[model samples]
Target: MKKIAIFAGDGIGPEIVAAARQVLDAVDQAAHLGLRCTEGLVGGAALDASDDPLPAASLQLAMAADAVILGAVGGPRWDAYPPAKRPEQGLLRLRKGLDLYANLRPAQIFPQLLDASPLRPELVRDVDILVVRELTGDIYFGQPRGLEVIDGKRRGFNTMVYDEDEIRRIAHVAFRAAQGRRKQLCSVDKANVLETTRLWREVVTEVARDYPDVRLSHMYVDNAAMQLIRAPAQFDVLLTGNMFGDILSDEASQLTGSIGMLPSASLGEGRAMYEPIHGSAPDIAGQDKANPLATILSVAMMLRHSLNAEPWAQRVEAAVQRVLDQGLRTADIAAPGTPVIGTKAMGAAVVNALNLK
Candidate 1:
């Protein structure tokens, strides 16, 4: 039996996660996977319930569960709160608590959403890039992260930091991923400027020596950003530090279709966390305008990475691909004239597609 902890966070988070739960239930019945899911409050919901974005009880459940699936977190509702009490803090704590160090963000183009991309179809087509971001480190979790007044001047600062082992481990994850893919790894960094990223480039280069078969290359983050739009498919596995990774991954998402179509997996030693790369999207929270595909695909990542159910994961993904093939567009990925479906119906379409197979 595979036990899953579901953290349906703020805004459209709950809606999208609910849709994913239905699909997971369908997968369980169809494949006899014997999976069980327990829901836990997070983000604004957690803050409201217990005044803690990540309640201790919820953390305990996640610790015991085999894998955790999260929807999205953070919104303007909790923006007034102090940095430590903000909704995003809970997510940061969870990643640190779980020791999830490697973040995998894949940018893959769906034929149906080609028109949804700002890039021409010829430029965006078959654009597949797997970005391996070193999570739980860098400026995000680094020291001295706060707003303060110094000498009658207000200033905010955060430390961008990383250790050798941290770099090595994430490099291994990126190299192995590249080995499995097209044998090309592009490590993005600001070696010329930041001392932290200088070490990042040095360590990643050292790790590359171990993987002789994989062709390794390096690109400065600035140039990397330009190259992504210029020709994305030129990259296979793009690796970078936490801050740069966070920025570049979002940029790469647009190349495919929409950020709502991207899914991510954060992995460490024991357990892994999966979630959609998009934010809570509070604007369309209850209107059913949010896309559930990312969260649904995150479930597939959970199955593949944590549960070791590759075939079942593929089935879930194939179901999604099949649905997209039918030209069923969510609002975010809808073209000029294509019909747009709400979250629940689009999710139901995937479930129905899976059942038919």
Candidate 2:
């Protein structure tokens, strides 16, 4: 039996994680996969109790599990904490601890919710692309980054460096993904300028040589941005560095309509982390108006990517699709003529469609 850890991080994080748990419980029972699960606390909750952002207990839990599923972290209560002690720091700590290098953010527009998108229905209806991002490397984890006085002026700087090994590993991840999907990979970079991006482009090109079955292409960051808008359908697997992937993904998510429908999976050497691509909506925390589809869809990601339960994952995805097609809506994805439900009701609707309690 494969085991997994659930951090259920701060704020409405708990609520959304619980909703996923209920859906997952049904999946485990139906799939007959005895998925052993453990729960741990991290972020502000851990900080309050342990005085440590990434508590020792949570780190241990993550280390021992095959994957760690996280809810969104960071909230207003601990906003006063020092930069190092903030909840988000804990999240970054866990990712580093797990050595999870690939951050995969998939942007797929559900068929039923095409009209709910800000894009013209025709343009977004067929949108399905994976942003295979290098999580642990690049500028995000670069060295000699700090703030100080330079020539009597306050200066801030961060290194945007990458080595051959880091580039090779991330490229491997993206190439393997392209193999299983559309067999096409778009390596996005700024090779003409940044040495780091040039290294990235060069390494991915070399990696592409090994995967002759996968069609590979390169797009400069600026051109990719323009090309993505001009023809998103042409893309299948998008591989890029940390900061570029981060920004590009946010843009891709919005292209599909609401962020409420996007689920992200971050994985690398050991434990994978799955979560919705949104933050803790504190104002809507107790209002029951939050959308839980992304969270539930994250469970599908957990099943497929983390737990290795593909059939069950497909079932869950299908259920969500069924509910969406039936005109079910959460506050975020609500259509004008349809009735919308709060977070709990939305989860129930998906689970009900799956015939789960």
Considering every candidate listed, which one attains the maximal TM-score?
Answer: 1
**Cα shift from native, residue 132, model 2 (Å):** 0.3
Task: Tell me the deviation in Å of residue 14 in model 2.
Answer: 1.2
lDDT of 2 by residue, 20-137 (tens): 7878888888787898999888888788888778888889988999878887788888978888899888888888889888888999887766766676676777888999988887
Question: What global local distance difference test value does model 1 have?
Answer: 0.90
Name the TM-score of candidate 2.
0.95
- In candidate 2, which residue ranges exceed 4 Å CA deviation? none
Specify the poorest-scoring 10-residue window by lDDT in model 1.
109-118
Backbone N/Cα/C clashes per model: 0, 1
| Candidate 1 Cα outliers beyond 4 Å, as residue runs | none
- Candidate 1, residue 100: Cα displacement in angstroms equals 0.8
The deviation in Å at residue 142 for candidate 2 is 0.9
The number of the candidate with the highest lDDT is 1
